[PDB]
Amino acid sequence: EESQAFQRQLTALIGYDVTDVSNVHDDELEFTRRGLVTPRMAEVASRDPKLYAMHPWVTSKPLPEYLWKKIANNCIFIVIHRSTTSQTIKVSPDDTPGAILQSFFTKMDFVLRVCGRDEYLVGETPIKNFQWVRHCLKNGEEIHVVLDTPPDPALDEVRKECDRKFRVKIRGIDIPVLDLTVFVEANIQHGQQVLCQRRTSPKPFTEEVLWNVWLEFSIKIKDLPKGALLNLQIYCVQLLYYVNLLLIDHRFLLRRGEYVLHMWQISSFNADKLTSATNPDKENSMSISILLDNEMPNQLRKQLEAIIATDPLNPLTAEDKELLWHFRYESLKHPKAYPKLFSSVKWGQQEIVAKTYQLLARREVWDQSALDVGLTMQLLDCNFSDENVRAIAVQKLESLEDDDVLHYLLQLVQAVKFEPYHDSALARFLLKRGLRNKRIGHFLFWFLRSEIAQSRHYQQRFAVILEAYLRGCGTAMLHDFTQQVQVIEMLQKVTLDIKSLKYDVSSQVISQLKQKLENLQNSQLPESFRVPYDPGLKAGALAIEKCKVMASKKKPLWLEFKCADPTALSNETIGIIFKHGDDLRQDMLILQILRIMESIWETESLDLCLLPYGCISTGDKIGMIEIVKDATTIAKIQQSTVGNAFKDEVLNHWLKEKSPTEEKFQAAVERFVYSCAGYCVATFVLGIGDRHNDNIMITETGNLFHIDFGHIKERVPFVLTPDFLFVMGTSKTSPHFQKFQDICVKAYLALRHHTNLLIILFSMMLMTGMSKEDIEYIRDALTVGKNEEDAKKYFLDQIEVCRDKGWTVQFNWFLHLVL
Ligand SMILES: Cc1nc(N)nc(-c2c(Nc3ccn[nH]3)nc3ccccn23)n1
């Protein structure tokens, strides 16, 4: 009764009932629910109670030069508040919070929490290595901390608990509601590669079509590898329906018996085409009925090395594969070659696979190599179905620190879509790291929940993983998650209702919104909740007066909240946009790559001032967007002066009038230069550079940033318009334009050092979140195969294209958004 009620809370928290067995043909999901019990308990029993409660957010990376140049006399100042008294203290960058606390005790046990935030400076780490400190230095802000009690670890209380050939019988297909022809195609797939293919005879396409044909494949039973898929597709010639069935299940048993599989409808490659899940809609979907009842030369070395050196998108010829395989032992000495090598494996040949597993027993070089995320991610994509191969990637991932896990978390969750089985090393890894650390666990929740809400293809899998995490995260976080879920469900209903009620926000609309928000505040809207994109902030009451409906196409809600923390230094509100219509999954992915790009630039001592705003997709074409404060649209700035034609002087004028002093205006101009360069490089590489300037914003302190990334004739590589160059003092060249060009080149070249990582992430993004030719764009953008000097000029030329095209492209967009 109590256990049954606890499951209902989980169901409401998850957004899917994991105990549901209406859409299964076996027990893989249950087996996985049972399988994850140990991994969960083990991490729960192993984590340090104190450090888990306080979740310090630290890094082992060096402090970049641009942050060292901001600290003088090897002295960082910290302000310590208590009750109504605060004192500034001189602290060395190398000091530990424990050593700092002894100073504020001798000078005249407690813990140092960040003022206005659930964020604690604790543990055996130098204060320079705390993220919040690094954040403070970055923005020239003082470190305000409060001396108070460590949270009670008791709050994280966890509740106690054969030589024959293979063949398939195609009985027939049926559709509830449909003179063309139709045929069934059956494929034995492994890692995108097709091992064997058979076809039924084409028949008239009616509501029921029977074949009763044994389709005999050329592959033997013994030759079938683990993770092999029977992929069943229906062509009428165009594809209409597909469904998959693992030939060897979770218990290493060959699949036998009768199956009636409800298939997926088609809207080139897509992660959804790989799913082992069946269509839950029995009432409306097509189904299929089946029956199963069964040492080297110098020239070659150069040839080999060339292959290894090619990018992850360069396809291998049979010649290249036969070369890699024959010299596998030599290939094994090169971590970089593992993806290509393991793609040269004939997986439909048992004795070859045996050799492959023996080859993986000689992993000395792999184990010893420095972790390479791009390389590691390559082995976790759709090209690799083998659990043993995939496990060596997850093994490399084990050495990542929390800081780094957070950088890659989203696409690691997405990568689970490429796993053949519900239980996998990667699933256990994510489960492990989320239970170890509250921040990773917070975002894991939202990432898993995002897919569960809008992916029928993977919700079952992801829902099982989420239940596993929620059963170990502890009572306190379960309370936080519940609070958060209640708030967003409430505000999503309001979002859709207002939208339902001409792109002119009428008087009666503004009235209705104010009404609905007041009625929530009084009723069940909890006094406070963690901000989903910023788990360190607690949002209090709605600041109703400041809430409005935006005069945009999709009519999004502009919401502002009080901070629940009374120790907050400011009276700043928390701004959240709730929107329906944009696919915010696409925003999430792009934003995540932007953060990775920022971390790449830090390693070369660059700060290009990107503003990768918080964003959490909560369902189909719906979610939340962090409001960047003091920010307006480049279009609106043009609208206010001109109306509808574009003037060059306007933007530089805007920065002047929004600046109090000359010193700050110079700082605003510098930030523009750095941030404009940052977005020019990032967007160009990503193929999202050609944007209408309604989708480009700038802060009152000069920080340019792109927004609304979902769903992306004269063309432009990026947006560097005449108004942008006028701020830089050009119409010719300038000290600011020279610096802009200098930053661009350095930023462009810095990304190219990480070519493989970017190609893979972009590649995975398109497969999980959006053909081959779309993916290949990034190779040309990253000028693979070209030296640096030649690459420098390439991007220099892209700047010149923008200068030549002036206002043409922008003007065209304006016309396009006038129909
Ligand atoms: C990150 C951010 N900050 C601000 N101030 N505004 C927005 C924003 C956005 N952002 C956004 C991100 C993704 N879709 N939309 N859309 C609108 C529409 C009207 C007015 C403002 N916005 N986004």
User: Which residue has the CA at smallest separation from atom 18 of ligand 1?
Assistant: 552
Asked if residues 419 and 390 have their Cβ atoms less than 8 Å apart, the reply is yes
DSSP bridge pairs for 196: 188
For residue 606, report the phi and psi dihedrals to the nearest 5 degrees.
Answer: -125, 145
Number of Cβ within 10 Å of residue 712's Cβ equals 15
Q: Which residues pair with 208 in a beta bridge?
A: 174
Place of tokens 């070089």: 365
549 lines ligand 1 (CB under 6 A): no
> Tokens 């009985």 — which residue?
171
Query: Does the Cβ of 734 fall within 6 Å of ligand 1?
Result: no
Q: Reduced to 3 states, what is the DSSP secondary structure of residue 705?
A: strand
Of ligand 1's listed atoms, the one at least distance from the Cα of 631 is 5
User: Rounded to the nearest 5°, which phi and psi values hold at 577?
Assistant: -100, 135
List the structure tokens of 132. 């919040």
Ligand 1: residue whose CA is nearest its atom 14 = 708
Task: Please identify which residue in the block is written with the tokens 């977005």.
Answer: 679
Q: Look-up: residue for tokens 């400041």?
A: 546
Ligand 1 pocket test, candidate residues 594, 691, 699, 708, most atoms within 8 A of CB: 708
Q: 60 near 124, Cβ under 8 Å?
A: no
- Which residue segments constitute the domains of the chain, with CATH numbers given? 1-160 (3.10.20.90), 161-294 (2.60.40.150), 295-474 (1.25.40.70), 475-629 (3.30.1010.10), 630-811 (1.10.1070.11)
Tokens 């797939």 belong to residue? 189
806 Cα to the center of ligand 1, angstroms: 26
On the 0-12 / 13-18 / 19+ scale of CB atoms within 10 A, 787 is exposed
**Which ranges of 422-571 would DSSP assign to H, the alpha helix?**
425-436, 438-454, 459-470, 475-500, 507-522
* d(C-alpha 354, C-alpha 371), whole Å: 27
Q: Which of 629, 502, 619, 497 is nearest to 557 (CA)?
A: 497
Kindly give, in sequence order, each residue whose CB lies less than 8 Å from that of residue 567, ignoring residues fewer than 6 positions away.
Answer: 81, 113, 115, 116, 146
- Give the whole-angstrom CA distance, residue 748 versus residue 781: 10
Q: Which residues pair with 204 in a beta bridge?
A: 181
Q: Is the CB of 696 under 6 A from ligand 1?
A: no
Torsion sign across C-alpha atoms 498, 499, 501, 507: positive
Distances (CA, A) of 168 to 103, 188, 199, 212, 290: 76, 11, 11, 10, 7
Task: Give the three-state DSSP class for 548.
Answer: strand
> Which tokens hold the place of 323?
């070369």
Cβ(707) – ligand 1 distance below 6 Å: yes
The C-alpha atoms of residue 633 and residue 498 are separated, in whole angstroms, by 24
Please name which of 627, 623, 511 lies closest in space to residue 561, comparing C-alpha atoms: 627
249 lines ligand 1 (CB under 6 A): no
Work out whether the CA dihedral 451, 452, 453, 458 comes out positive or negative: positive
Whole-angstrom distance, CA of residue 444 vs CA of residue 437? 10
Both tokens assigned to 486:
């209640």
Binding-site residues from annotation for ATP: 575-584, 610-618, 705-712
DSSP 701: T
Are the C-beta atoms of residues 711 and 585 closer than 8 Å to each other? Answer: no
Tokens describing residue 796: 């220099």
Instruction: Count CB atoms within 10 A of the CB of residue 294.
Output: 14
Task: Name, in order, each residue with C-beta under 8 angstroms of 93's C-beta and a sequence gap of 6 or more.
Answer: 63, 71, 74, 76, 126, 127, 128
Looking from the CA of residue 582, the nearest atom of ligand 1 is 14
375-387 b/e with 16+ CB inside 10 Å = b?
A: bbbbbbbbbbbbb
Q: Which residues contact 454 (CB under 8 A, 6 or more apart)?
A: 585, 617, 619, 620
In the numeric block, which tokens belong to residue 679? 């977005």
Q: Which residue has the tokens 């192993």?
A: 46
Would you say the CB of residue 628 lies under 6 angstroms from ligand 1? yes
Q: How far apart are CA 779 and CA 304, in angstroms?
A: 21
Q: Is 627 in the pocket of ligand 1 (CB under 6 A)?
A: yes
Tokens of 418: 């490429």
Testing ligand 1's pocket by substitution, the residue of 625, 636, 704 carrying the most ligand atoms inside 8 A of its CB is 625
Beta-sheet pairing, 76-82 with 143-148: parallel
* CA-based nearest residue to 510, from 551, 451, 482, 470: 551
* In contact, 148 and 82? CB cutoff 8 Å: yes
- Residue 524, number of CB atoms within 10 A of its CB: 9
The owner of tokens 């993806």 is 339
| Burial per residue of 550-567, b for 16 or more beta-carbon CB atoms within 10 angstroms, e otherwise | eeeeebbbbbbbbbbbee
Q: Token digits for 516?
A: 């609905």
Give the DSSP letter of residue 234: E
Dihedral sign of CA atoms 622, 628, 632, 634 in order: negative
Q: Is the CB of 41 under 6 A from ligand 1?
A: no
Give the method used.
X-ray
What is the phi/psi pair of residue 636, to 5°? -60, -40
Q: How many other C-beta atoms can be found within 10 angstroms of the C-beta atom of residue 161? A: 8
